[PDB]
Amino acid sequence: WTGQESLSDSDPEMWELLQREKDRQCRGLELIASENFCSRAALEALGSCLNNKYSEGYPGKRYYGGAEVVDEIELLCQRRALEAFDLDPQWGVNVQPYSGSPANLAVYTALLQPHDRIMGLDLPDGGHLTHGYMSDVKRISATSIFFESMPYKLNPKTGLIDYNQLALTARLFRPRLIIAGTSAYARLIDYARMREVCDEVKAHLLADMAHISGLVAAKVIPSPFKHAIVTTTTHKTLRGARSGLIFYRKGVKREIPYTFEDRINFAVFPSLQGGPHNHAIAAVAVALKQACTPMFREYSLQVLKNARAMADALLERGYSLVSGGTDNHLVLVDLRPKGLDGARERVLELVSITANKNTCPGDRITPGGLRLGAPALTSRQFREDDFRRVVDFIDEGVNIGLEVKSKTAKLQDFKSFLLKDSETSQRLANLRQRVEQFARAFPMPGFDEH
Amino acid sequence: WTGQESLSDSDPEMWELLQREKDRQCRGLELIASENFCSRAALEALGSCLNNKYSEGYPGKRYYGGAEVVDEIELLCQRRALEAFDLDPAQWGVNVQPYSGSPANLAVYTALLQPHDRIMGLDLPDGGHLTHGYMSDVKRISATSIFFESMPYKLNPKTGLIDYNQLALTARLFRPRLIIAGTSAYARLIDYARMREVCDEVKAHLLADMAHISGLVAAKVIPSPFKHADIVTTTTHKTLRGARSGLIFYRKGVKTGREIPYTFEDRINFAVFPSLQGGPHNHAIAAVAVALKQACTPMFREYSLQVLKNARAMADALLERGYSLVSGGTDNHLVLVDLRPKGLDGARAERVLELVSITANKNTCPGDITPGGLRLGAPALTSRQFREDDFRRVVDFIDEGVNIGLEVKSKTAKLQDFKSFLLKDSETSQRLANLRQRVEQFARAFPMPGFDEH
Amino acid sequence: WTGQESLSDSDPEMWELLQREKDRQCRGLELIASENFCSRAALEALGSCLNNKYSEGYPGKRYYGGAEVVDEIELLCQRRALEAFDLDPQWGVNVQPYSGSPANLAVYTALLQPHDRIMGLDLPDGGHLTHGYMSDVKRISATSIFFESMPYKLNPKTGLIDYNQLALTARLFRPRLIIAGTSAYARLIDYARMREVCDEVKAHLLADMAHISGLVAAKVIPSPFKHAIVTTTTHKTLRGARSGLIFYRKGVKREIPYTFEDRINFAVFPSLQGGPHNHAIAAVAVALKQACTPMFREYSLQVLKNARAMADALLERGYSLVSGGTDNHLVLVDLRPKGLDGARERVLELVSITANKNTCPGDRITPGGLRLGAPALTSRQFREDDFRRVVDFIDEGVNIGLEVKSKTAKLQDFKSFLLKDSETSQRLANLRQRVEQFARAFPMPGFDEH
Amino acid sequence: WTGQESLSDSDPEMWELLQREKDRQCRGLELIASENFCSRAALEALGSCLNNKYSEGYPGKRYYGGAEVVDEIELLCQRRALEAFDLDPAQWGVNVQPYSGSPANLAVYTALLQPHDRIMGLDLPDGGHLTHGYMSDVKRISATSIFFESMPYKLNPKTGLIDYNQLALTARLFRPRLIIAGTSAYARLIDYARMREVCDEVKAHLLADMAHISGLVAAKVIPSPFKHADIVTTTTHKTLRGARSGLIFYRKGVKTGREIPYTFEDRINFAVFPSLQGGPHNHAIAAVAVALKQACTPMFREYSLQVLKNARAMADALLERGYSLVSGGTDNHLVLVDLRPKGLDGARAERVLELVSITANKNTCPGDITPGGLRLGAPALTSRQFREDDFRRVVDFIDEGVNIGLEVKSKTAKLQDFKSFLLKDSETSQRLANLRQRVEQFARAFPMPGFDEH
């Protein structure tokens, strides 16, 4: 045993399940909002020898040693972050977060004291749990256990941010930080609006560029670097490895400076994390060079044009859509007026198009909508003529659930309907086969084999 | 643009630094204790297409969909983790989603302890990690010390072993809710049954950190903490020779007439998700499961027994050169040389051997901001098929390297001037070039796990 | 030296200032809302030998010994509390709080965990600080430091409790306890209203009977013992010594019981306090027997009739009045439409009628109204014909401040106006003399001498 | 109804119990340490018309109005407090609004410490109060332990003195923000300069509790803590022979070129109001100021020297009867008899002497839920013009009373049965009646401060 044997011959049991997943990602049209298909160039760096380097430290201030190469890869991800997200090196960025969720908790540990107060878009309102979600029976997110805070909702019959129930709940809550983060929100954030709301309440505003990372970088969608520190994930829209970073402003705000400088750096290490995943830091810096290319500018223009083409086709098929339309990479289809809901995701799962339940902007265990994300298959060189091609397959998939829902009542029986009916089982097996035949016809980033 | 281009031509600027570090890992003698060289089989799965699967959920309990195949790597990683440390699945459970060892430690705190509850951990300048609860005398630095109150338990400064007396004493005076038997820089073994008797007298949860001894415990090479602890956290890398991730081992099953249950299973699983993390790094989950099956093989046992034999040969050789080792010696994978009797501190050595391409780290010796010792790690080069005869050759290179720094200390005074002395002195740099190149010729001659090119 | 010498001969320096205060309390018409004049029978028990008894314990569960007499005085205050505030001994009461503020913090330590959440009427909205008041620069009340919580406001152009901004801010805050407490609020609390709001939000509702203690006891004003635990002070309206108590429901709410039982008893001791002020517990129990008398029923009917007579006379004099009128013991005069404000209290201070600034229901350092309390001089056998007699003296006092305000700008100069003008100094010296001559003509509870 | 009726005719039901307790205070030998008999001059001011003055504010900084005269009692109470303990007003300040000693202690915590900061205090079963931070091994009971984290510092169990070694040790391991030199049941004196060296090595605020030694310090009878402490809290009653209130003493004035200031003045004043309290109990503020001027007189010095002489005569007499005293003896106002060598616990004695009209309290002796000793207090009867010859007569009555309980223990077993034995046994009750009545004849013969009638 040497340690350089092939995965196919060292452990064929895992090689089995590795390329069975590569099959399913090519066999199916992944329309999950948070999902993307990383490039081979970044996937090669993700599984590189940089995993064998413990670099607990910082540029010039490392507690270890021998981090010669890792230092310049360290700063290059920073330089590429300042170049993919313009502005004078006036701005600083930290690239050590293990993912997007640790990036949000890090900024809280950096700027907020324990049990300090936050404002955040509720998870059933277009956010993730990192934004501060307590349930009415239990505290769910650690951002809600270590920091007390209250949800920030949007207009339930308009789909845009409710700035009336915002300044109201703000003056009555006086938090130290609010979040303008998006997980399921189809339009644009008014940055200048909430910035002065944050000084009326004396709060810092933080967003999540998780679903718009590449949209802001290619100047296709507006950026916060004149109206906001704000954190983001590496993947989803930037088409990279699983990591995260935190964008903080540096310099003056003698004049008063900006305090968002070394406390964020101190929060990710040595406060919350330890060894930087240097293989991920380099993998994403390859995708950070991807973000400075003209192809990425055209790819990003493709994802919005495709998200609007997906919407306009979804619009004509008889679907109501919260928000009114779309101005991002995502769709928030409202299926309740069409007799469908979010949970009855299982039907399209056995057809091999992966979606997710989404909180209905205004309903009452069963959600009422679902969330589709364009950039996943748009990375497969999809087009708008192929983006109304998707819609007929979603329209066909809805009709299978719409008919079995009329033949049942329970949903423990609705999902068992697709298993024992042996007639809908004929209809699903045939439906996925053409979805598999269609999905396999487009290129797929990454390795041909794994 | 297709997305399947080679890294060498898509970004030659990173291909530049990718094999320049692969050179430096072959170019240098990595003596860091926490560092290892992962296997090629795991690196292929680590940078696989499993990064393109968002599986926010749990095996069979996922809020998303299409998780048919991606689930099976999780449950197989579960079974392989319970098999690498010989735990029958009806008595023990394991969670394989922690992104690393630090999120794994904080997850157990959020799972069993309430905010501002009390923790006890070996102090960092005494052999512990930051996740164990380390405050400075001016500031709380680690998040385990901000969200949870904590107090250190130090060692006997003239014994080098964990003072298990000043632990049970101050525990009765502190009433903590969880104690850690976790080690980052300590050359001997933790008396787990001892810490078991302290943890049930005060009613506290006992957690260990197999971070530096995971594979030593996996090969049954050293006594295990899975019989004297309720929780056990570990890293997937370090001694286990895997990807950078973490695990959490919790006991399941049975613990008036009615029986006491076990509460850790569903509280730990809730802490890692949806409380603290989000998308599970499945590319790492599969990579560490690949190193988990290798870890159940007789080859991994032989490797782990070699790590001990090499760590003791490195220690016994350093002893004869006139060096001091706290605790007296070693029974694990690491050495903790005390450089104070040799007229040199921890930091100034760490710079000398760094520019010679022997990677060490400063370590604080019981006594005194600038340390006086270093931490040497066997499992890094033991994975390079090193032997004891090749591990006393390393020691002579360290002994020769110390004398280079020991002489510049006589020619300088400060340490802002000590580090620029080793750069411009065309005579000590000439002596450095011979030692650095000769270590390179020695280090480059050994095999290296992973891709030769990547 | 024996220890039984008279205060007049042992320390004449303090006897001087003791009977100079008894002069000023008789020489002036105390119209402070929180103020009352205690009876001699209770004042005698307040300075009794019960100060020399350390009774750290509880009925039958005392850690000390020899508390034979103090036990029956202990329970008698309880029995008199259950008799002055009817209902089956279904209800329990704790009589150890040192005052009213420690009573509120005790119920929080009893039912709430540290940093749990509260809802409370803001201090500038009719509450005290015990209700949870944070300033926009500093946390002021300890109820706001040990428990995070947010204010509960009222309708700013109606004066009644804003139940729209109540259920709104409630669902978005999900606290464990809300307060319905009054310090400056002229009307009645809808108890049944907020009780079900407290179960929609899953919160306990606590009030402060501080300004209505005797009004609820004589059945003149509605009680909470069917729609609420709720704490109160001993004095203000009950005309007793300075202490406090906490009223908690006992028994069932097998059936689920009420948890408000031994945790309140544990919070006042041994958690927050120590030695019970037994001299105060007995002094107030004398005033608790006062609350079961027909005279107290007629006295309480006098305070409301006088508060409405004071209002109706204040109404006709050209004063606007928030809330619309009055249904309690208090007045919340709105002086801004009359060119006066709250701060310009100094004028009537040198005239010897003591008032206090009150937060204007809707203004912008200088408040805009003041708070008068009827039960203070109503204890001096005042009448309604004597309660419009007050109004002309308040009307005259306003006109002194209204004219000097036109002759100055600053208020550091407005208060120095009444010192150096030597013409308004003639007008104030003459004004207080007839106020002193009028106030001295009525009986005064307590000792003739001290 | 006028409001000026006599208590005897307005409520004869309370006049019933008012002089029935005044009887019982003359009827019995009050041996409680914390208890004293307040002066008539203070009782007149305590139940004065100053209860009818709401003065939410501070001398010169009141948010209300008409506080002309009521202010002057405050500032005079300030001056008299600084004069009773010899503190020049430019170096020390005092706050006179705390309702008692417990709100005074928590006020200093809210003033200088943040929530969940750390406190150190002598454990309650070791000689401390609850305000010092006492948690049980199952529950946090005192509010000082819920809002602030804390840990006890115990005593040497075979010395009876405060272990100042296991204090500076565990302090370096605990990094507290404030330590207390406060005592509730400890017969010797606290080494303040010792606790001063521990409190500045860890940078912590040193606070004392003169609760049991306020008047002993006021008469300069025992060494004072006003030279080795930044804060000092005290009760107005107990040894100071005043009304039930509290005080807080903080240092003011001066503590690179620039000088260090003192931060306690405006932080302490803000904690007592408007943070924690509301209306100042001015009737108590004036009452304690009356006892504060008496405390600066040679009569109060003679009384305080007598409290020591009587406490030592009580101790030396108990020693000869075959009783044990922890610490060895006494140098303050209290005795801590250890009843375990006499075959009897703390609780069962406390019942016997209670029904004989000698008031004691159970006290836990270093060793073991049901104590084994009691706490005897001199200043209660020393205020009744007691002498040492009259304080060994008390001891013989305690010695005789113990033998009554020592024999019933041989005739019963439980303590639910021990307390009903002393009630229905027409033979031990006959022996109790002689001892109780003869203590009554002795106790009734001494003067009593306060009203004879009230």
Ligand SMILES: Nc1nc(=O)c2c(ccn2CCCCc2ccc(C(=O)N[C@H](CCC(=O)N[C@@H](CCC(=O)N[C@H](CCC(=O)O)C(=O)O)C(=O)O)C(=O)O)c(F)c2)[nH]1
């Ligand atoms: N066994 C063990 N366990 C582990 O876990 C471990 C290993 C190996 C790796 N690992 C895991 C990774 C270990 C990570 C780690 C460790 C310790 C500290 C720490 O705490 N050091 C302080 C000094 C740190 C300190 O003063 N920080 C100041 C900065 C002040 C400054 O920069 N300059 C001032 C200027 C003042 C003037 O103007 O005069 C000066 O001159 O001092 C602050 O934060 O404020 C100390 O050594 O005590 C740490 F942070 C981060 N082995």
Ligand SMILES: Nc1nc(=O)c2c(ccn2CCCCc2ccc(C(=O)N[C@H](CCC(=O)N[C@@H](CCC(=O)N[C@H](CCC(=O)O)C(=O)O)C(=O)O)C(=O)O)c(F)c2)[nH]1
């Ligand atoms: N030097 C000193 N300092 C002072 O400050 C001081 C003095 C003199 C006066 N002062 C100031 C006043 C002192 C105030 C003070 C003191 C101690 C405790 C305390 O903490 N005691 C616990 C037992 C207390 C305890 O178990 N409480 C249970 C109740 C459980 C129960 O009632 N029954 C169960 C049934 C179980 C079954 O069904 O089996 C049983 O049987 O045990 C709880 O709270 O849950 C102990 O002694 O350790 C205290 F609370 C309150 N002298």
